[PDB]
Amino acid sequence: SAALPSIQLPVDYNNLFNEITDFLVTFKQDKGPKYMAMLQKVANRELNSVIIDLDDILQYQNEKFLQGTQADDLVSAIQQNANHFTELFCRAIDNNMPLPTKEIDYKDDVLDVILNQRRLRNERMLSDRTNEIRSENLMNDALREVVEDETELFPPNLTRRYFLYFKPLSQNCA
């Protein structure tokens, strides 16, 4: 505590992550949301790169301001410290990742089938913890929360097939 002292920075990452998720799910100004359309494409394996436009985030913040809601400056936070927001946006995309509408066939990449295999394996190990603890007979919320403490799953960075990039916000659109 005396060593490695704490500092008070104006950056709150919890509501910044909430804003990131809201922007990913609700932004549609560029038929539905642009970014879930892109994540749906990624799920079906037509795209392996996610480009996050800073113009889109700035426009989303401007629209939120126009309707009266006070939104944190996500664009400025990304510009000041961009390494953390690649990490953040990847987690947010993983949370809102649509299920693929195309099944895995023999013409898919080896990386895609490996990721599908480990995803199914970790969901099966979750289910196996759950069934074992149910058989032990010791609320489903607590049961689940025990399961994710006693599971060694594949982390999201190992079940991840896309790449994240930040397109700078245009000078005219600044």
């Binding site: 032990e136 010791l138 919320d141 049961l143 929360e145």
Partner: peptide, 27 residues
């Protein structure tokens, strides 16, 4: 004990001690 405690908290603990007793023949 971790499983029981977490499953029972909804209506950290240290390593538990084994206090073993017996009624067998005594030296």
């Amino acid at each position: 004990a971790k499983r029981i405690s977490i499953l029972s908290r909804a209506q950290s603990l240290p390593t538990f001690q084994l206090i073993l007793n017996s009624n067998a023949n005594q030296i």
